[PDB]
């Protein structure tokens, strides 16, 4: 603990954002110290853990049990609710987010839907009068979008025209692999409803890419790909460590020191034995995700920064955002045979933009392509059937089982707030994160129409045993807690992800995003991390 562990740039968090930033920085000759609170994880061990996970945890979507939660850096588990992330408010169920702590972070078990936001998403307030504008435009993030797509190996609908879609200067590095039966059938069914089901851009290998195998449809992207055919954030960490970046797992950053100019001079992290190590660097980045970045900023409150690091605007932990989801499950009249290809292959993008966004939230409706064999087996076993009837029921329910979702855009609300829990602490004494969440009348008005659209989809499919969630579900895209902007009094970071209060501190996270958008947010986070890498390289060279 005596050593001061110096580096040029120290990046707190070794997820996709932190690892991509570290890889870009070491590629350009900067010394990088990459700290992660979680442990090193092996893909094959996670695969074995998922295989030996009980089938009820496969039927329902348990994406955390295969990753053992470490007591010093616990992450969220929900089948036994481990009570790490405390959620309050009327829509608490919608912020029961899933995160994974470790080298490679939550991208260890994501679905790899790598999405570009629309140009109007960056200017939501200037276009529709709701929410907030990004500090930069889509044209400014486009090169970084492409750089992230090329590094992560995104496949997309290259030759197709999607009316709401980000304008691309270059084609996708790979072309979207062909639909499975479920996606073809769902596209044809919802085309008659006026819904445009289009291929989801995915950080998945439709051909051998980056020395990694082509996707063979293991249909387990969430929570682990056994063969690495999809992009995981651990790839960038491995590449950075190969180029000289120093990675320290089980390094729980808890303290930050500032000088008279409010520049970060050092940070202090704990090992699993609660021994303190003081890292010193020329530049500090926090890439710890939208929950742990604000949690660390509030926990690291100083005398100079009594309300938290970079919290002069009191906006750290506020404006917490996600995509509130409504889930529906039913049995299609005709076989759908979910499981061909990746877990998420297509989605309805027709409602990603429009004038209605001045009144209610724009939405993304999608079909879940996860194989329904575990769900069918558990349901048929619970039905009390034996013999040939049991086999027939299992086959019919795995052929006809359909999972549908509708995700909405939530506006940045200052009362949708993450704070330090006053009642719960982890093994290191660090308070748990507590989020008060309300989707708002924007999302409620959008959901009034989204529920009708989901029921129309179920009716068009002849659905039976229709089960719509009476609550909003979390979609694991944590944004807005460290909002960006141009005014230091109304934002935490600027267009370059540099904190207004500390010229030395960068926040490479989705918490900087000023709008949740309508689709998955991690590709935008990666592009923002690469943009922050450019800013850091300009600073240090």
């Amino acid at each position: 603990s005596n050593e001061t562990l110096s580096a040029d740039v120290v990046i707190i968090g070794a997820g996709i954002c932190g690892s991509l930033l570290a890889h870009k920085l070491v590629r350009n000759g900067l010394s990088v110290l990459l700290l992660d609170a979680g442990p090193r994880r092996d893909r094959s061990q996670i695969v074995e853990n998922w295989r030996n996970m009980p089938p009820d945890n496969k039927s329902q979507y348990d994406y955390a049990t295969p990753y053992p939660s470490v007591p010093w850096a616990p992450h969220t588990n929900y089948f036994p609710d481990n009570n790490y992330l405390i959620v309050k408010g009327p829509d608490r169920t919608a912020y029961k987010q899933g995160i994974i702590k470790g080298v490679g972070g939550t991208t260890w078990h994501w679905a790899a839907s790598s999405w570009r936001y629309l140009p109007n998403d960056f200017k939501l307030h200037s276009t529709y009068g709701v929410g907030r504008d990004y500090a930069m435009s889509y044209d400014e993030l486009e090169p970084y979008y492409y750089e992230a797509e090329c590094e992560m190996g995104v496949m997309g609908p290259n030759g197709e025209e999607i009316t709401p879609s980000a304008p691309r200067q270059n084609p996708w590095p790979m072309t979207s692999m062909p639909y499975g039966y479920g996606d073809r059938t769902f596209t044809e069914i919802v085309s008659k409803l006026g819904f445009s089901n289009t291929p989801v851009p995915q950080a998945r290998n439709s051909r051998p890419y980056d020395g990694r195998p082509q996707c063979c449809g293991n249909n387990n992207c969430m929570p682990i790909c056994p063969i690495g055919a999809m992009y995981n954030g651990v790839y960038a960490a491995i590449k950075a460590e190969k180029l000289g970046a120093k990675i320290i797992p089980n390094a729980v950053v808890y303290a930050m020191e500032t000088d008279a100019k409010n520049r970060i001079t050092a940070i202090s992290f704990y090992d699993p034995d609660k021994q303190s190590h003081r890292v010193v660097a020329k530049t500090f980045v926090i890439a710890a995700n939208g929950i742990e970045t604000p949690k660390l900023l509030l926990l690291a409150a100083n005398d100079r920064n009594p309300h938290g690091i970079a919290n002069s605007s009191d906006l750290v932990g506020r404006n917490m955002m996600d995509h509130p989801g409504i889930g529906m499950s039913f049995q299609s009249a005709e076989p759908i045979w979910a499981g061909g290809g990746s877990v998420q292959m297509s989605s309805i993008t027709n409602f990603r933009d429009g004038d209605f966004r001045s009144e209610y939230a724009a939405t993304q409706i999608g079909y879940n392509n996860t194989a329904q064999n575990s769900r069918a087996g558990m349901k048929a076993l619970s039905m009390g059937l034996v013999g040939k009837k049991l086999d027939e029921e299992i086959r019919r329910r795995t052929a006809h089982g359909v999972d549908i979702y509708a995700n909405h855009e939530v506006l940045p609300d200052p009362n949708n707030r993450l704070v330090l829990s006053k009642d719960y602490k982890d093994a290191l004494g660090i308070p748990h994160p507590e989020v008060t969440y309300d989707v708002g009348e924007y999302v409620r008005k959008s959901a009034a129409i989204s529920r009708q659209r989901l029921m129309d989809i179920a009716k068009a499919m002849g659905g039976t045993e229709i089960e719509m969630t009476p609550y909003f579900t979390p979609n694991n895209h944590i944004t807005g807690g460290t909002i960006m902007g141009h005014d230091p009094r109304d934002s935490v970071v600027d267009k370059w992800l540099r904190t207004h209060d500390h010229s030395n501190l960068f926040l490479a996270t989705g918490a900087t995003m000023a709008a949740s958008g309508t689709v998955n947010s991690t590709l935008t986070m990666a592009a923002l991390s690469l943009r922050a890498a450019d800013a850091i390289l300009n600073d240090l060279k």
Binding site: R40, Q45, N52, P68, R207, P208, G211, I227, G228
Partner: protein
């Protein structure tokens, strides 16, 4: 200039010219005689090239490719893909750069010449490298339950468990590969059936990368530089031992030292 041996037809002479002069198969399939010169005593009898080993390709029914069908030999030389053998490493590079563009007549001539190469048998050879039948898997799903709440493979020392976790997605638990043949069967495979496990270890260390007809087929690498799943020398040796004892030659053994030597580019 090639000399036309008039005691053989034109196909044989063309095949000899392609093998010896043009495609120079003996440049890495014929052992150098420690003078950095080809050993005429063992022509096309197998050699070590860096981390890989070019096997015996004489007409030996067991040691070489004598028991290969002509169709299988043609398909392997043209595309590098066969139900019993897949070209990897230097063979994949040779096929995707020179052989895949050869005319069908030229590859047929190469096969005709190869069928006439004198046989060079080996000491420990009783069945062909593609004639090793499979043994039932010894993996236990129940025994893996104790390894839950583990984040790494360190405490997974069982060979069957390691093969199942790292390797049984693409190749199956019985080691017979995929039905369509994209993932090769480890049972009956020439790489796993060789008494020399070199090419097996290399296959684990570097994966397979062959581009034929503008179509790329890739096994990911599993060595220290792996992006999918890095494996130590001990883990690779254990997986290779399980593969050999269940899906391949059971008289071949792999130690961690052997994997280390293969990682170092073989013997220097």
């Amino acid at each position: 200039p090639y000399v036309f041996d008039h005691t053989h037809n034109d196909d044989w002479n063309r095949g000899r010219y392609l093998v010896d002069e043009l495609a120079h198969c003996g440049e890495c399939h014929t052992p150098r005689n420690f003078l950095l010169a080809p050993n005429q005593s063992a022509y096309l009898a197998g050699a070590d090239i860096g981390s890989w080993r070019a096997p015996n390709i004489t007409n030996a029914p067991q040691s070489g490719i004598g028991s290969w069908s002509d169709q299988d030999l043609f398909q392997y030389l043209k595309t590098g893909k066969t139900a019993h053998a897949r070209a990897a490493g230097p063979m994949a590079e040779a096929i995707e750069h020179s052989l895949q563009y050869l005319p069908d007549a030229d590859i047929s001539a190469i096969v005709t010449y190869l069928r006439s190469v004198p046989a060079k048998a080996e000491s420990g050879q009783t069945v062909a490298n593609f004639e090793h039948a499979g043994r039932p898997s010894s993996y236990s799903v129940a025994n893996a339950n104790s390894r839950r709440s583990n984040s790494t493979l360190t405490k997974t020392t069982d060979g069957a468990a390691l093969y199942e976790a790292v390797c049984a997605s693409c190749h199956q638990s019985d080691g017979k590969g995929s039905k369509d043949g994209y993932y090769p069967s480890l049972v009956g495979n020439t790489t796993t059936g060789q008494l020399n496990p070199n090419d097996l270890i290399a296959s684990i260390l570097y994966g397979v990368d062959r581009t034929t007809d503008n179509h790329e087929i890739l096994m990911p690498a599993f060595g220290p530089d792996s992006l999918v799943q890095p494996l130590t020398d001990e883990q690779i040796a254990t997986i290779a031992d399980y593969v050999l004892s269940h899906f391949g030659n059971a008289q071949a053994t792999v130690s961690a030292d052997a994997v280390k030597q293969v990682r170092a580019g073989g013997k220097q």
